[PDB]
Protein backbone atom coordinates (compact mmCIF):
# COMPACT_ATOMS: atom_id res chain seq x y z
CA UNK A 1 0.00 0.00 0.00
CA UNK A 2 1.39 3.64 1.40
CA UNK A 3 4.40 5.03 0.86
CA UNK A 4 4.97 8.02 3.47
CA UNK A 5 8.84 9.78 3.84
CA UNK A 6 9.46 12.67 5.75
CA UNK A 7 12.57 14.88 4.46
CA UNK A 8 14.91 16.41 5.69
CA UNK A 9 15.04 12.37 6.98
CA UNK A 10 16.58 13.40 10.09
CA UNK A 11 17.58 16.80 11.90
CA UNK A 12 19.31 18.92 14.32
CA UNK A 13 17.93 21.89 16.14
CA UNK A 14 20.02 24.35 17.88
CA UNK A 15 18.21 25.74 21.13
CA UNK A 16 16.28 28.34 20.09
CA UNK A 17 16.41 28.17 16.56
CA UNK A 18 13.35 26.51 14.00
CA UNK A 19 13.46 23.43 11.14
CA UNK A 20 10.60 21.76 9.59
CA UNK A 21 9.70 18.61 8.35
CA UNK A 22 7.76 17.58 5.06
CA UNK A 23 6.06 13.95 5.29
CA UNK A 24 5.14 13.25 2.09
CA UNK A 25 2.58 10.49 0.77
CA UNK A 26 2.96 8.77 -2.81
CA UNK A 27 1.13 8.42 -5.57
CA UNK A 28 -2.11 10.05 -3.27
CA UNK A 29 -5.14 8.75 -3.81
CA UNK A 30 -7.10 10.92 -1.35
CA UNK A 31 -9.49 11.40 1.28
CA UNK A 32 -6.78 9.69 3.14
CA UNK A 33 -5.75 11.35 7.14
CA UNK A 34 -2.45 12.73 7.55
CA UNK A 35 -1.53 13.33 11.40
CA UNK A 36 1.85 13.88 13.54
CA UNK A 37 1.93 12.59 16.82
CA UNK A 38 5.12 14.26 19.42
CA UNK A 39 7.80 11.77 20.70
CA UNK A 40 5.46 11.56 23.76
CA UNK A 41 3.00 9.58 21.66
CA UNK A 42 0.49 12.92 21.58
CA UNK A 43 -1.22 13.84 18.55
CA UNK A 44 -0.49 17.04 17.43
CA UNK A 45 -3.44 19.89 16.84
CA UNK A 46 -3.05 21.59 13.56
CA UNK A 47 -1.83 25.11 13.08
CA UNK A 48 -0.68 26.00 16.55
CA UNK A 49 1.87 28.58 16.88
CA UNK A 50 4.99 27.15 17.97
CA UNK A 51 4.93 23.67 16.76
CA UNK A 52 3.36 24.44 13.72
CA UNK A 53 1.39 21.06 11.48
CA UNK A 54 0.52 22.81 8.45
CA UNK A 55 -1.41 20.42 5.53
CA UNK A 56 -0.24 21.85 2.30
CA UNK A 57 -2.29 19.36 -0.29
CA UNK A 58 -4.00 16.39 0.46
CA UNK A 59 -0.47 15.03 -0.77
CA UNK A 60 1.85 16.08 2.28
CA UNK A 61 1.67 17.93 5.42
CA UNK A 62 4.42 19.89 7.18
CA UNK A 63 5.78 20.07 10.71
CA UNK A 64 7.54 23.19 11.81
CA UNK A 65 9.56 23.34 14.99
CA UNK A 66 10.21 27.33 15.76
CA UNK A 67 12.23 28.11 18.89
CA UNK A 68 13.44 24.69 19.53
CA UNK A 69 13.89 23.91 23.67
CA UNK A 70 15.30 20.61 24.72
CA UNK A 71 12.00 19.10 25.43
CA UNK A 72 11.53 19.15 21.66
CA UNK A 73 13.92 16.26 21.10
CA UNK A 74 12.82 12.84 20.36
CA UNK A 75 11.09 10.69 17.50
CA UNK A 76 8.00 12.43 15.85
CA UNK A 77 6.07 10.65 13.74
CA UNK A 78 3.81 10.71 10.95
CA UNK A 79 0.68 8.49 10.17
CA UNK A 80 -1.87 8.33 7.27
CA UNK A 81 -4.84 7.10 7.76
CA UNK A 82 -6.72 5.68 4.41
CA UNK A 83 -10.55 5.89 3.99
CA UNK A 84 -10.76 1.61 5.26
CA UNK A 85 -8.33 2.23 8.27
CA UNK A 86 -5.43 0.75 6.83
CA UNK A 87 -2.13 3.19 8.28
CA UNK A 88 1.38 3.49 6.87
CA UNK A 89 4.08 6.06 8.94
CA UNK A 90 7.41 7.46 8.67
CA UNK A 91 9.26 8.76 11.66
CA UNK A 92 11.64 11.31 11.90
CA UNK A 93 14.98 11.72 14.80
CA UNK A 94 14.89 15.38 16.12
CA UNK A 95 17.91 16.26 18.18
CA UNK A 96 18.14 19.40 19.90
CA UNK A 97 21.95 21.00 20.92
CA UNK A 98 23.79 23.72 21.84
CA UNK A 99 25.31 25.09 19.29
CA UNK A 100 29.17 27.06 20.91
CA UNK A 101 27.82 30.84 21.57
CA UNK A 102 28.66 33.30 23.63
CA UNK A 103 27.01 34.38 26.31
CA UNK A 104 28.17 37.06 28.03
CA UNK A 105 31.84 37.98 27.34
CA UNK A 106 31.74 41.75 27.49
CA UNK A 107 33.79 44.63 25.88
CA UNK A 108 35.76 45.87 26.71
CA UNK A 109 36.55 44.72 30.16
CA UNK A 110 38.61 47.05 32.54
CA UNK A 111 41.00 46.73 35.07
CA UNK A 112 42.81 48.95 37.07
CA UNK A 113 46.82 48.59 36.76
CA UNK A 114 48.72 45.90 38.90
CA UNK A 115 45.69 44.10 40.00
CA UNK A 116 45.00 39.78 38.89
CA UNK A 117 42.90 40.36 36.03
CA UNK A 118 40.04 38.07 35.14
CA UNK A 119 38.83 38.13 31.51
CA UNK A 120 35.49 37.20 31.82
CA UNK A 121 34.10 34.36 28.46
CA UNK A 122 31.09 32.78 29.06
CA UNK A 123 30.06 30.26 26.60
CA UNK A 124 27.53 27.49 26.01
CA UNK A 125 27.36 24.43 24.35
CA UNK A 126 25.95 20.81 24.58
CA UNK A 127 29.27 18.99 24.14
CA UNK A 128 32.50 20.97 26.39
CA UNK A 129 33.80 23.76 24.65
CA UNK A 130 37.90 23.42 24.60
CA UNK A 131 39.18 27.11 25.00
CA UNK A 132 41.65 29.21 23.89
CA UNK A 133 42.73 32.37 24.77
CA UNK A 134 44.58 34.66 21.60
CA UNK A 135 46.44 37.87 21.57
CA UNK A 136 48.01 39.17 18.82
CA UNK A 137 47.71 36.02 16.57
CA UNK A 138 49.44 33.91 19.64
CA UNK A 139 47.67 31.83 22.16
CA UNK A 140 48.84 33.23 25.46
CA UNK A 141 50.03 29.79 26.99
CA UNK A 142 52.84 28.33 24.43
CA UNK A 143 54.99 31.66 25.79
CA UNK A 144 54.29 30.62 29.53
CA UNK A 145 54.81 34.38 30.70
CA UNK A 146 53.79 33.41 33.99
CA UNK A 147 51.53 35.44 34.53
CA UNK A 148 49.25 34.19 32.15
CA UNK A 149 46.70 31.96 33.30
CA UNK A 150 43.53 29.86 31.90
CA UNK A 151 41.52 29.06 34.75
CA UNK A 152 39.35 26.23 35.72
CA UNK A 153 36.03 28.23 34.57
CA UNK A 154 37.66 28.85 31.30
CA UNK A 155 38.24 32.77 31.67
CA UNK A 156 42.19 34.18 31.33
CA UNK A 157 44.02 35.68 34.41
CA UNK A 158 46.49 37.87 33.93
CA UNK A 159 48.15 38.62 37.45
CA UNK A 160 49.48 42.33 38.09
CA UNK A 161 48.29 43.52 35.21
CA UNK A 162 50.67 46.14 33.57
CA UNK A 163 49.43 49.15 31.40
CA UNK A 164 51.21 47.05 28.17
CA UNK A 165 48.98 44.25 28.52
CA UNK A 166 46.17 45.99 27.21
CA UNK A 167 45.01 45.52 23.76
CA UNK A 168 42.63 42.98 21.71
CA UNK A 169 42.28 39.25 23.51
CA UNK A 170 40.74 36.47 21.82
CA UNK A 171 38.35 34.10 23.05
CA UNK A 172 38.07 31.05 20.91
CA UNK A 173 35.94 27.78 21.22
CA UNK A 174 36.49 24.93 19.83
CA UNK A 175 34.41 21.27 20.23
CA UNK A 176 36.28 18.74 18.52
CA UNK A 177 33.78 15.91 17.51
CA UNK A 178 32.01 18.47 15.10
CA UNK A 179 35.68 20.78 14.22
CA UNK A 180 33.17 23.60 15.56
CA UNK A 181 34.66 26.86 16.33
CA UNK A 182 33.53 30.75 17.00
CA UNK A 183 35.51 32.94 19.27
CA UNK A 184 35.22 36.57 20.48
CA UNK A 185 37.58 39.75 20.59
CA UNK A 186 37.62 41.23 23.83
CA UNK A 187 39.45 44.73 24.50
CA UNK A 188 41.02 44.96 27.62
CA UNK A 189 41.59 48.33 29.16
CA UNK A 190 44.32 49.23 31.76
CA UNK A 191 43.28 52.47 33.86
CA UNK A 192 46.32 54.06 35.70
CA UNK A 193 45.32 55.87 38.95
CA UNK A 194 46.35 59.92 39.03
CA UNK A 195 49.35 61.36 40.42
CA UNK A 196 49.21 65.24 40.96
CA UNK A 197 51.72 68.06 42.05
CA UNK A 198 51.04 71.42 42.75
CA UNK A 199 53.01 73.70 40.24
CA UNK A 200 53.77 76.86 42.79
CA UNK A 201 52.92 75.37 46.71
CA UNK A 202 52.94 78.94 48.20
CA UNK A 203 51.74 81.85 47.15
CA UNK A 204 51.49 85.50 47.83
CA UNK A 205 49.06 87.47 46.33
CA UNK A 206 48.29 91.63 47.23
CA UNK A 207 44.97 92.74 48.19
CA UNK A 208 42.28 95.10 46.51
CA UNK A 209 44.58 96.07 43.44
CA UNK A 210 42.28 93.98 41.73
CA UNK A 211 44.59 91.49 40.46
CA UNK A 212 43.96 87.53 39.63
CA UNK A 213 46.39 85.06 40.72
CA UNK A 214 46.82 81.77 39.04
CA UNK A 215 46.87 78.65 41.30
CA UNK A 216 47.68 75.13 38.94
CA UNK A 217 48.34 71.52 39.70
CA UNK A 218 49.80 69.03 37.16
CA UNK A 219 48.27 65.76 37.02
CA UNK A 220 48.18 62.66 35.27
CA UNK A 221 46.47 59.45 34.88
CA UNK A 222 44.62 57.18 32.77
CA UNK A 223 41.57 58.40 31.77
CA UNK A 224 43.11 61.51 32.14
CA UNK A 225 41.92 63.13 35.77
CA UNK A 226 39.30 65.32 35.94
CA UNK A 227 40.19 67.71 38.70
CA UNK A 228 37.71 69.78 41.08
CA UNK A 229 39.35 72.06 44.15
CA UNK A 230 38.37 73.11 48.04
CA UNK A 231 38.40 75.84 49.43
CA UNK A 232 39.81 75.68 53.17
CA UNK A 233 37.69 72.11 52.48
CA UNK A 234 35.18 73.98 51.17
CA UNK A 235 33.92 73.02 47.89
CA UNK A 236 34.30 75.58 44.62
CA UNK A 237 31.86 75.65 41.57
CA UNK A 238 33.36 75.21 38.39
CA UNK A 239 30.11 76.92 36.75
CA UNK A 240 28.53 81.44 35.35
CA UNK A 241 31.59 82.55 37.26
CA UNK A 242 33.25 86.45 37.79
CA UNK A 243 35.98 85.40 40.22
CA UNK A 244 36.53 81.44 39.76
CA UNK A 245 38.05 80.64 36.74
CA UNK A 246 38.75 77.11 35.75
CA UNK A 247 40.50 75.67 32.81
CA UNK A 248 38.99 73.05 30.57
CA UNK A 249 40.99 70.13 32.70
CA UNK A 250 40.28 72.60 35.85
CA UNK A 251 43.70 71.90 36.15
CA UNK A 252 43.86 75.55 36.71
CA UNK A 253 42.12 77.87 39.09
CA UNK A 254 42.21 81.70 38.44
CA UNK A 255 41.30 83.70 41.36
CA UNK A 256 39.92 87.14 40.01
CA UNK A 257 40.01 90.25 42.20
CA UNK A 258 41.71 89.28 45.16
CA UNK A 259 41.40 90.23 48.74
CA UNK A 260 41.99 88.63 51.66
CA UNK A 261 39.30 86.57 51.50
CA UNK A 262 41.06 84.65 49.04
CA UNK A 263 43.69 83.71 51.44
CA UNK A 264 43.12 79.91 52.52
CA UNK A 265 44.66 76.64 51.56
CA UNK A 266 43.06 75.09 47.92
CA UNK A 267 43.25 71.42 47.37
CA UNK A 268 43.16 69.75 43.98
CA UNK A 269 41.28 66.86 43.67
CA UNK A 270 42.76 64.74 40.72
CA UNK A 271 40.34 61.67 39.87
CA UNK A 272 39.81 58.74 37.49
CA UNK A 273 37.85 55.75 37.70
CA UNK A 274 41.16 54.17 38.84
CA UNK A 275 41.91 56.38 42.04
CA UNK A 276 42.41 59.62 43.38
CA UNK A 277 45.36 61.87 44.59
CA UNK A 278 45.46 65.86 45.25
CA UNK A 279 47.57 68.53 46.23
CA UNK A 280 48.03 71.79 48.50
CA UNK A 281 48.78 75.18 47.43
CA UNK A 282 48.47 78.11 50.09
CA UNK A 283 47.12 81.46 49.04
CA UNK A 284 48.54 84.37 51.36
CA UNK A 285 47.03 87.73 50.97
CA UNK A 286 48.66 90.90 51.80
CA UNK A 287 46.89 93.85 52.54
CA UNK A 288 47.94 96.79 49.74
CA UNK B 1 51.42 -0.41 9.77
CA UNK B 2 50.55 3.19 10.49
CA UNK B 3 46.95 4.37 10.62
CA UNK B 4 45.88 7.58 10.46
CA UNK B 5 42.60 9.72 10.97
CA UNK B 6 40.27 13.02 10.95
CA UNK B 7 38.13 14.38 12.88
CA UNK B 8 35.48 14.95 12.24
CA UNK B 9 35.68 12.58 9.59
CA UNK B 10 34.28 14.53 7.03
CA UNK B 11 32.74 18.42 7.33
CA UNK B 12 30.96 21.45 5.88
CA UNK B 13 31.72 24.83 6.01
CA UNK B 14 29.54 28.12 5.32
CA UNK B 15 30.74 30.79 3.69
CA UNK B 16 32.74 32.97 5.50
CA UNK B 17 32.82 30.85 9.08
CA UNK B 18 35.62 28.28 10.31
CA UNK B 19 36.26 24.68 10.98
CA UNK B 20 38.97 22.62 11.53
CA UNK B 21 39.84 19.07 11.68
CA UNK B 22 42.35 16.94 13.68
CA UNK B 23 44.60 14.41 11.65
CA UNK B 24 45.47 11.79 14.42
CA UNK B 25 48.25 8.43 13.82
CA UNK B 26 47.82 5.68 16.18
CA UNK B 27 50.06 4.64 18.74
CA UNK B 28 52.72 6.77 17.57
CA UNK B 29 56.45 5.52 18.04
CA UNK B 30 58.28 8.88 16.72
CA UNK B 31 60.24 10.92 14.10
CA UNK B 32 57.60 10.21 11.77
CA UNK B 33 56.47 13.19 9.41
CA UNK B 34 52.70 14.74 9.29
CA UNK B 35 51.81 16.93 6.27
CA UNK B 36 48.79 18.19 4.59
CA UNK B 37 47.82 18.80 1.28
CA UNK B 38 45.03 21.36 0.04
CA UNK B 39 42.53 19.73 -2.85
CA UNK B 40 44.33 21.33 -5.90
CA UNK B 41 47.46 18.65 -4.61
CA UNK B 42 49.88 21.30 -2.73
CA UNK B 43 51.40 20.93 0.37
CA UNK B 44 50.46 23.39 3.10
CA UNK B 45 53.31 25.28 4.58
CA UNK B 46 52.86 25.39 8.32
CA UNK B 47 51.38 28.16 10.59
CA UNK B 48 49.89 30.39 8.12
CA UNK B 49 47.18 32.69 9.16
CA UNK B 50 43.72 31.98 7.40
CA UNK B 51 44.29 27.79 5.87
CA UNK B 52 46.29 26.88 9.31
CA UNK B 53 47.96 23.58 10.03
CA UNK B 54 49.36 23.49 13.33
CA UNK B 55 51.04 20.94 14.77
CA UNK B 56 50.01 19.35 18.19
CA UNK B 57 52.30 16.79 19.72
CA UNK B 58 54.23 14.60 17.39
CA UNK B 59 51.03 12.56 17.50
CA UNK B 60 49.00 14.91 15.49
CA UNK B 61 48.13 17.48 13.33
CA UNK B 62 45.25 20.53 12.94
CA UNK B 63 43.93 21.86 10.11
CA UNK B 64 41.88 24.78 10.44
CA UNK B 65 40.40 26.62 7.74
CA UNK B 66 39.34 30.47 8.75
CA UNK B 67 36.92 32.25 6.73
CA UNK B 68 36.04 29.66 4.26
CA UNK B 69 35.29 30.78 1.07
CA UNK B 70 33.78 28.67 -2.07
CA UNK B 71 37.60 27.37 -2.95
CA UNK B 72 38.60 26.22 -0.09
CA UNK B 73 36.14 22.89 -0.92
CA UNK B 74 37.60 19.82 -2.09
CA UNK B 75 39.39 16.79 -0.59
CA UNK B 76 42.37 17.77 2.11
CA UNK B 77 44.40 14.87 2.72
CA UNK B 78 47.16 13.97 5.52
CA UNK B 79 49.81 12.47 5.02
CA UNK B 80 52.42 10.77 7.62
CA UNK B 81 55.43 9.59 6.28
CA UNK B 82 57.81 6.81 8.96
CA UNK B 83 61.69 7.37 9.19
CA UNK B 84 61.99 5.21 6.43
CA UNK B 85 59.49 6.75 3.92
CA UNK B 86 56.89 4.31 4.15
CA UNK B 87 53.63 6.54 4.15
CA UNK B 88 49.85 6.11 5.42
CA UNK B 89 47.29 8.84 4.59
CA UNK B 90 43.71 10.13 5.60
CA UNK B 91 41.20 12.27 3.39
CA UNK B 92 38.53 14.43 4.67
CA UNK B 93 35.95 15.70 2.16
CA UNK B 94 35.46 19.27 2.70
CA UNK B 95 32.14 21.11 1.22
CA UNK B 96 31.68 25.03 1.24
CA UNK B 97 27.60 26.05 1.45
CA UNK B 98 25.94 29.17 1.97
CA UNK B 99 23.73 28.70 4.56
CA UNK B 100 20.74 30.92 4.51
CA UNK B 101 20.91 34.30 5.33
CA UNK B 102 19.47 38.03 4.80
CA UNK B 103 22.21 39.94 2.39
CA UNK B 104 19.68 43.29 2.35
CA UNK B 105 16.50 43.68 4.18
CA UNK B 106 16.07 47.32 5.79
CA UNK B 107 13.44 48.05 7.85
CA UNK B 108 11.67 49.87 7.97
CA UNK B 109 10.57 50.28 4.43
CA UNK B 110 8.72 53.22 4.06
CA UNK B 111 6.26 54.03 1.14
CA UNK B 112 3.79 56.72 0.38
CA UNK B 113 0.14 55.46 0.49
CA UNK B 114 -0.76 54.45 -3.00
CA UNK B 115 1.56 53.68 -4.59
CA UNK B 116 2.84 50.34 -5.01
CA UNK B 117 4.66 49.39 -2.67
CA UNK B 118 7.56 46.95 -2.94
CA UNK B 119 9.39 45.39 0.26
CA UNK B 120 12.86 43.93 -0.53
CA UNK B 121 14.20 41.08 1.06
CA UNK B 122 17.44 39.29 -0.04
CA UNK B 123 18.23 36.32 0.66
CA UNK B 124 21.09 33.88 -0.22
CA UNK B 125 21.90 30.61 0.33
CA UNK B 126 23.84 27.46 -2.10
CA UNK B 127 20.36 25.43 -2.94
CA UNK B 128 17.42 28.19 -3.96
CA UNK B 129 14.92 29.25 -0.98
CA UNK B 130 10.91 29.20 -0.95
CA UNK B 131 10.03 32.71 0.23
CA UNK B 132 7.31 33.18 2.47
CA UNK B 133 5.53 36.81 3.44
CA UNK B 134 3.51 36.88 6.64
CA UNK B 135 1.81 39.53 8.68
CA UNK B 136 -0.07 39.06 11.91
CA UNK B 137 0.43 35.36 11.71
CA UNK B 138 -0.78 34.75 8.40
CA UNK B 139 0.83 33.92 4.79
CA UNK B 140 -0.69 37.16 2.38
CA UNK B 141 -0.78 35.14 0.01
CA UNK B 142 -3.68 32.58 0.96
CA UNK B 143 -6.16 35.45 1.52
CA UNK B 144 -5.89 36.20 -1.75
CA UNK B 145 -6.45 40.40 -1.53
CA UNK B 146 -5.55 40.98 -5.57
CA UNK B 147 -2.96 43.80 -4.13
CA UNK B 148 -0.54 41.00 -2.64
CA UNK B 149 1.54 39.41 -4.60
CA UNK B 150 5.05 38.25 -4.36
CA UNK B 151 7.61 38.71 -7.03
CA UNK B 152 9.89 36.94 -9.12
CA UNK B 153 13.13 38.33 -7.55
CA UNK B 154 10.49 36.74 -3.99
CA UNK B 155 9.73 40.47 -3.14
CA UNK B 156 6.76 41.16 -1.63
CA UNK B 157 4.70 44.24 -4.01
CA UNK B 158 1.37 45.34 -2.03
CA UNK B 159 -0.54 47.44 -4.85
CA UNK B 160 -2.24 51.13 -3.80
CA UNK B 161 -0.62 50.54 0.22
CA UNK B 162 -2.78 51.93 2.03
CA UNK B 163 -2.29 53.47 5.74
CA UNK B 164 -4.20 50.30 6.85
CA UNK B 165 -1.31 48.46 5.30
CA UNK B 166 1.44 49.34 7.91
CA UNK B 167 2.51 46.84 10.15
CA UNK B 168 5.35 44.00 10.58
CA UNK B 169 5.53 42.03 8.10
CA UNK B 170 7.61 38.64 7.71
CA UNK B 171 9.87 37.20 5.31
CA UNK B 172 10.56 33.85 5.64
CA UNK B 173 13.05 31.73 3.96
CA UNK B 174 12.56 27.37 3.65
CA UNK B 175 14.99 25.23 1.75
CA UNK B 176 13.43 21.94 2.00
CA UNK B 177 16.34 19.27 1.28
CA UNK B 178 17.86 20.85 4.90
CA UNK B 179 14.48 22.01 6.65
CA UNK B 180 16.02 25.15 6.73
CA UNK B 181 14.70 28.01 8.45
CA UNK B 182 15.71 32.13 8.83
CA UNK B 183 13.42 34.94 8.76
CA UNK B 184 12.99 38.82 9.03
CA UNK B 185 10.62 40.83 10.74
CA UNK B 186 10.08 44.21 8.34
CA UNK B 187 8.45 46.92 9.64
CA UNK B 188 6.07 48.96 7.09
CA UNK B 189 5.22 52.09 7.08
CA UNK B 190 2.79 54.35 4.67
CA UNK B 191 3.45 58.15 4.98
CA UNK B 192 0.40 60.57 3.49
CA UNK B 193 1.21 63.53 1.92
CA UNK B 194 -0.15 67.09 4.05
CA UNK B 195 -3.10 69.09 3.88
CA UNK B 196 -3.40 71.97 5.04
CA UNK B 197 -6.12 74.77 5.40
CA UNK B 198 -6.41 78.47 6.99
CA UNK B 199 -8.49 78.86 9.67
CA UNK B 200 -8.91 82.75 8.16
CA UNK B 201 -8.00 83.90 4.60
CA UNK B 202 -8.36 87.06 5.21
CA UNK B 203 -7.26 89.37 8.18
CA UNK B 204 -7.61 93.15 8.93
CA UNK B 205 -5.48 94.82 11.05
CA UNK B 206 -5.36 98.61 12.54
CA UNK B 207 -1.52 99.87 12.09
CA UNK B 208 0.33 101.86 15.04
CA UNK B 209 -1.65 100.70 18.00
CA UNK B 210 1.65 98.20 19.17
CA UNK B 211 -1.05 95.22 18.50
CA UNK B 212 -0.81 91.26 17.42
CA UNK B 213 -2.13 89.56 15.19
CA UNK B 214 -1.74 85.75 14.82
CA UNK B 215 -2.34 83.63 11.12
CA UNK B 216 -3.41 80.30 11.90
CA UNK B 217 -3.20 76.98 9.65
CA UNK B 218 -4.49 73.72 10.40
CA UNK B 219 -2.41 70.75 8.79
CA UNK B 220 -1.94 67.51 8.83
CA UNK B 221 -0.96 63.92 7.31
CA UNK B 222 2.13 61.53 8.46
CA UNK B 223 4.55 62.48 9.17
CA UNK B 224 3.25 65.53 11.02
CA UNK B 225 3.41 68.30 8.75
CA UNK B 226 6.31 70.88 9.08
CA UNK B 227 5.21 74.50 8.64
CA UNK B 228 7.49 77.14 7.21
CA UNK B 229 6.18 80.51 5.78
CA UNK B 230 6.41 83.42 3.29
CA UNK B 231 5.90 87.19 2.86
CA UNK B 232 4.51 87.83 -0.37
CA UNK B 233 6.94 85.26 -1.73
CA UNK B 234 10.02 86.05 0.60
CA UNK B 235 10.81 83.18 3.02
CA UNK B 236 9.99 84.40 7.41
CA UNK B 237 12.72 82.96 9.94
CA UNK B 238 11.58 81.31 12.55
CA UNK B 239 14.83 81.81 14.58
CA UNK B 240 15.91 85.72 18.00
CA UNK B 241 12.49 87.16 17.28
CA UNK B 242 11.16 90.40 17.79
CA UNK B 243 8.21 90.95 15.76
CA UNK B 244 7.70 87.09 14.36
CA UNK B 245 6.81 84.77 16.88
CA UNK B 246 6.00 80.85 15.43
CA UNK B 247 4.32 78.22 17.75
CA UNK B 248 6.09 74.85 18.06
CA UNK B 249 5.08 73.26 15.07
CA UNK B 250 4.92 77.10 13.26
CA UNK B 251 0.88 76.50 12.52
CA UNK B 252 0.44 79.93 14.33
CA UNK B 253 2.38 83.45 12.72
CA UNK B 254 2.01 86.04 15.40
CA UNK B 255 2.92 89.26 14.27
CA UNK B 256 3.63 91.55 17.10
CA UNK B 257 3.57 95.43 16.71
CA UNK B 258 1.56 95.65 12.85
CA UNK B 259 2.31 98.71 11.18
CA UNK B 260 1.53 99.00 7.14
CA UNK B 261 4.58 97.13 6.02
CA UNK B 262 2.88 93.94 7.73
CA UNK B 263 0.14 94.22 5.19
CA UNK B 264 0.61 91.15 2.17
CA UNK B 265 0.29 87.75 1.33
CA UNK B 266 1.07 85.03 3.82
CA UNK B 267 1.72 81.53 2.77
CA UNK B 268 1.78 78.42 4.93
CA UNK B 269 4.00 75.43 3.55
CA UNK B 270 2.97 72.58 5.07
CA UNK B 271 4.99 69.69 4.30
CA UNK B 272 6.81 66.05 5.04
CA UNK B 273 8.55 63.52 3.51
CA UNK B 274 5.70 62.57 0.99
CA UNK B 275 4.20 65.57 0.00
CA UNK B 276 3.45 69.44 0.43
CA UNK B 277 0.43 71.67 0.07
CA UNK B 278 -0.10 75.66 1.08
CA UNK B 279 -2.81 78.04 1.50
CA UNK B 280 -2.63 81.82 1.52
CA UNK B 281 -3.98 84.50 3.99
CA UNK B 282 -4.29 87.89 3.00
CA UNK B 283 -3.52 90.09 6.02
CA UNK B 284 -4.80 94.15 4.94
CA UNK B 285 -3.77 96.56 7.67
CA UNK B 286 -5.14 100.15 8.23
CA UNK B 287 -4.01 103.27 9.50
CA UNK B 288 -4.81 104.20 12.92
Redesign the interface.
Given at each position: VLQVDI??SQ?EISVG??????CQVAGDAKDKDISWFSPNGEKLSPNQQRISVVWNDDDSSTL?I?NANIDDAGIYKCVVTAEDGTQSEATVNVKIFQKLMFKNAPTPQEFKEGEDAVIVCDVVSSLPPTIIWKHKGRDVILKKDVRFIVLSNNYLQIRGIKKTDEGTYRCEG?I??????NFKDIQVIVNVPPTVQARQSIVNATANLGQSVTLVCDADGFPEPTMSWTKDGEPIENEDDEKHIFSDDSSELTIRNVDKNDEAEYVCIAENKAGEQDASIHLKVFAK
Amino acid sequence: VLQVDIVPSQGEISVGESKFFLCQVAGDAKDKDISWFSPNGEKLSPNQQRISVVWNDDDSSTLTIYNANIDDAGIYKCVVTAEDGTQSEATVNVKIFQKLMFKNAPTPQEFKEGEDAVIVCDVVSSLPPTIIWKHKGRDVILKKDVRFIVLSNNYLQIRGIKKTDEGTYRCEGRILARGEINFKDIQVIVNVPPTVQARQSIVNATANLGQSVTLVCDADGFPEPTMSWTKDGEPIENEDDEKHIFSDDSSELTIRNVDKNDEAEYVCIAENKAGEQDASIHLKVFAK
